[PDB]
Scaffold this active site. Structure first.
Site, short mmCIF file in Angstrom:
data_model
loop_
_atom_site.label_atom_id
_atom_site.label_comp_id
_atom_site.label_asym_id
_atom_site.label_seq_id
_atom_site.Cartn_x
_atom_site.Cartn_y
_atom_site.Cartn_z
N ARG A 231 55.81 -25.21 -34.60
CA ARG A 231 54.88 -26.12 -33.94
C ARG A 231 54.80 -25.77 -32.45
NH1 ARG A 231 52.67 -26.73 -37.94
NH2 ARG A 231 52.36 -28.64 -39.15
N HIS A 279 46.88 -20.16 -35.28
CA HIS A 279 47.50 -21.05 -36.28
C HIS A 279 47.05 -20.70 -37.69
CE1 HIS A 279 49.39 -25.33 -36.93
NE2 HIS A 279 49.65 -24.51 -37.93
N1 LIG Z 1 52.11 -21.70 -38.48
C1 LIG Z 1 51.79 -22.13 -39.70
O1 LIG Z 1 50.75 -21.76 -40.28
C2 LIG Z 1 52.70 -23.07 -40.42
C3 LIG Z 1 53.69 -23.74 -39.79
N2 LIG Z 1 54.61 -24.51 -40.46
C4 LIG Z 1 55.69 -25.19 -39.76
O2 LIG Z 1 56.91 -24.71 -40.29
C5 LIG Z 1 57.84 -25.81 -40.31
C6 LIG Z 1 59.01 -25.50 -41.21
O3 LIG Z 1 58.58 -25.59 -42.58
P1 LIG Z 1 59.61 -25.65 -43.75
O4 LIG Z 1 60.50 -24.48 -43.77
O5 LIG Z 1 58.89 -25.84 -45.06
O6 LIG Z 1 60.50 -26.94 -43.46
P2 LIG Z 1 61.93 -27.34 -44.04
O7 LIG Z 1 62.04 -28.78 -43.97
O8 LIG Z 1 62.05 -26.79 -45.45
O9 LIG Z 1 63.03 -26.65 -43.15
C7 LIG Z 1 63.14 -27.05 -41.77
C8 LIG Z 1 64.35 -26.41 -41.17
O10 LIG Z 1 64.44 -26.78 -39.77
C9 LIG Z 1 65.76 -27.20 -39.51
N3 LIG Z 1 65.76 -28.15 -38.41
C10 LIG Z 1 65.00 -29.29 -38.31
N4 LIG Z 1 65.29 -30.03 -37.26
C11 LIG Z 1 66.30 -29.32 -36.63
C12 LIG Z 1 67.08 -29.60 -35.49
N5 LIG Z 1 66.94 -30.70 -34.75
N6 LIG Z 1 68.04 -28.71 -35.15
C13 LIG Z 1 68.21 -27.62 -35.91
N7 LIG Z 1 67.54 -27.25 -37.01
C14 LIG Z 1 66.60 -28.16 -37.32
C15 LIG Z 1 66.24 -27.82 -40.81
O11 LIG Z 1 67.68 -27.94 -40.78
P3 LIG Z 1 68.47 -28.52 -42.07
O12 LIG Z 1 68.32 -27.47 -43.13
O13 LIG Z 1 69.89 -28.70 -41.61
O14 LIG Z 1 67.82 -29.81 -42.44
C16 LIG Z 1 65.68 -26.83 -41.82
O15 LIG Z 1 66.59 -25.75 -41.97
C17 LIG Z 1 56.97 -26.99 -40.70
O16 LIG Z 1 57.61 -28.21 -40.35
C18 LIG Z 1 55.68 -26.72 -39.92
O17 LIG Z 1 55.68 -27.34 -38.64
C19 LIG Z 1 54.50 -24.64 -41.82
C20 LIG Z 1 53.54 -24.07 -42.51
C21 LIG Z 1 52.53 -23.19 -41.89
#
Ligand SMILES: NC(=O)C1=CN([C@@H]2O[C@H](COP(=O)(O)OP(=O)(O)OC[C@H]3O[C@@H](n4cnc5c(N)ncnc54)[C@H](OP(=O)(O)O)[C@@H]3O)[C@@H](O)[C@H]2O)C=CC1
Ligand SMILES: NC(=O)C1=CN([C@@H]2O[C@H](COP(=O)(O)OP(=O)(O)OC[C@H]3O[C@@H](n4cnc5c(N)ncnc54)[C@H](OP(=O)(O)O)[C@@H]3O)[C@@H](O)[C@H]2O)C=CC1
Lengths: 316, 316
Positions: A231, A279
């Site tokens: 993001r 994006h």
């Molecule tokens: N550019 C684009 O076209 C796209 C962008 N995205 C973005 O990608 C993001 C990730 O997607 P996705 O992999 O499916 O999400 P997931 O929920 O599957 O994974 C998110 C990861 O981020 C980690 N995380 C979240 N908050 C924190 C924090 N405070 N500190 C450390 N690590 C953190 C989580 O840790 P933990 O495992 O410990 O919970 C997890 O490992 C989406 O939220 C979206 O914003 C998605 C699709 C397309």
């Protein structure tokens, strides 16, 4: 069954097309049509939302499940009157594999000096550029969820050394991982930072000058690289600009921006060794989202658990 | 033992540096040094050659083994007075993995419209370009040797549909393969052609208009793509130019050219969706080459078979 409320503010032509056959057993109400703006939709059970109207939950106050139009849910979290109900995000094999295409491509373009090759090509200059092999470079993936784990696996196959950071500790064979409190340790080992974090209050304004100055400096690429496809509000763009100009960062690849579309006068467009995509890192085909919502509605309604439900406490 | 004769016309400063410690048990004669060029090196047993002097075998007429400075040996085949002795090519894990980095990067840049993204970025234009996922696209790899097999494996991991063509039939799990007589079948299924063939009389002037017009036309990328990192004399560049201009090819990636360095007046430099690299797809460190020759000399001299010996009848 009442029709599905659809408020998806991307690709409105694509949305209109798919909706002609989607939710065949109940139909849909598309808020892209201005005539649906003032409709009584108080009995709606399911809403499919991407950058939705701020008052949507006043107008649809009896929802059973909210579906995000994407993998991210930051547009829904924090909305006024957000009901205490499941929010289901988009998780899909095609989406995942497309993100890994982009990540691996960007990592390779930095490894192999694509920017320099393109600059020389534009000048009709033949100039061999000495590149390290992937194994000499550590890619640090921030976020080890659906997207992060797929990217880690494919980067490793290409030969990169890979490490990972996530909120809670992960076990990934062959990949050193670090949890929330170990951020500085992770940063110190990272040559190419790949951002695949969701936007939460904890990750807002996160990628800043202080963080860039903690990335590894004496690596095979010379200067570290910042890649983000999570993001845009997770990064401080003024700090990215200053870091690249100063040589703190050797380059960047950015799919997401603090305000999108990226302003025409942003310095990022013409920064040396910076790649910009609008994006579009993981744009899954228009129908896959709707097939997904249909499936989850079907599971829900016959007593199977909803999948891909976000943790309200964690905020993703 | 007499010193090793070195005539390697790349990176002469790098060659001079490595030779200070290479062949510790006998030393070397570097023809880059003018003082060596007219020395009597008639008792030379081993020569290491890259774009060597045309008269080398008159001047070193008692060679036991010839080592190529690269994986290709077309610079050696056809030389005047070429002795009937083993020619050992350079095969190396670092070389292989670097070629696969290049191949995968080029395939991804075509899949994901890198050229179009870059053109828009240079104009400060935000413009989403709809890409198919890798699985919707067939990459046809021509040459299934050391380089071809590595590229096939990594392309498949990235999600491409992959097929292969080689002279003799191969068995590769999950990859449909085609032999010499099945060329037209293979071409008709191929959206992105990847060239990893050696230069032989059979592959000279091989990638021509007629071949480009046999590639698959109704695929997910729209028009097929020609990628070549084998040898430049395998392609007809006039035909590449006309094919791209006319829309027969949607784009190309070329690391190798009929005449290198590519002439400044080549039309290739400015063609839309064409990527040029200056024969640097797989540039292994000089140390690796020299360690390799040392190893084979050692095997040879203690009675073990030489590895990576070319088949004179096959021409590679
Ligand atoms: N550019 C684009 O076209 C796209 C962008 N995205 C973005 O990608 C993001 C990730 O997607 P996705 O992999 O499916 O999400 P997931 O929920 O599957 O994974 C998110 C990861 O981020 C980690 N995380 C979240 N908050 C924190 C924090 N405070 N500190 C450390 N690590 C953190 C989580 O840790 P933990 O495992 O410990 O919970 C997890 O490992 C989406 O939220 C979206 O914003 C998605 C699709 C397309
Ligand atoms: N751009 C660069 O930086 C580099 C370029 N190269 C080039 O790559 C080439 C390939 O190297 P490498 O993989 O190690 O070589 P290999 O000898 O391991 O493999 C060559 C492959 O080409 C196939 N082949 C040869 N002739 C024909 C033909 N007439 N029709 C069909 N298939 C044919 C062979 O078929 P079969 O299996 O039946 O014998 C084999 O599969 C080198 O010769 C060199 O020219 C190499 C290194 C770096």
């Amino acid at each position: 069954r009442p029709p599905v409320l659809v408020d998806i503010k991307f690709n409105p032509e694509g949305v209109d097309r798919v909706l002609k056959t989607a939710f065949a057993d109940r139909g849909s109400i598309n808020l892209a049509d201005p005539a649906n703006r003032e409709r009584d939709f108080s009995e709606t059970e399911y809403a499919l939302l991407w950058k939705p109207d701020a008052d949507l939950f006043r107008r649809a106050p009896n929802l059973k499940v909210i579906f995000s139009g994407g993998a991210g849910v930051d547009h829904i979290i924090g909305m006024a009157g957000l009901p205490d109900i499941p929010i289901v995000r988009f998780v899909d094999r095609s989406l995942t594999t497309r993100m890994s295409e982009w990540v691996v491509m960007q990592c390779l373009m930095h490894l192999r000096g694509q920017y320099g090759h393109d600059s020389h090509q534009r000048r009709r200059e033949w100039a061999k550029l000495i590149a390290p092999e992937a194994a000499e470079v550590t890619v640090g993936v921030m976020g080890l969820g659906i997207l992060g784990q797929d990217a880690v696996a494919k980067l490793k196959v290409m030969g990169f050394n890979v490490i990972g950071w996530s909120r809670t500790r992960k076990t990934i064979e062959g990949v050193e991982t670090f949890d929330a409190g170990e951020l500085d340790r992770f940063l110190a080992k990272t040559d190419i930072l790949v951002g695949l974090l969701p936007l939460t209050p904890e990750t807002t304004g996160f990628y800043d000058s202080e963080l860039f100055k903690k990335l590894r400096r004496d690596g095979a690429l010379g200067q570290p690289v910042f890649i983000n496809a999570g993001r845009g509000k997770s990064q401080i763009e003024t700090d990215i600009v200053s870091a690249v100009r100063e040589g703190t960062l050797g380059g960047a690849s950015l799919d997401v921006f603090e305000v999108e579309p990226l302003a025409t006068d942003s310095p990022l467009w013409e920064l040396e060794n910076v790649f910009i995509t609008p994006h579009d890192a993981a744009v899954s085909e228009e129908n896959a989202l709707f097939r997904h919502v249909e499936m989850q509605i079907a599971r829900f309604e016959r007593g199977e658990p909803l999948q891909f439900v976000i943790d309200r406490a964690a905020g993703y």
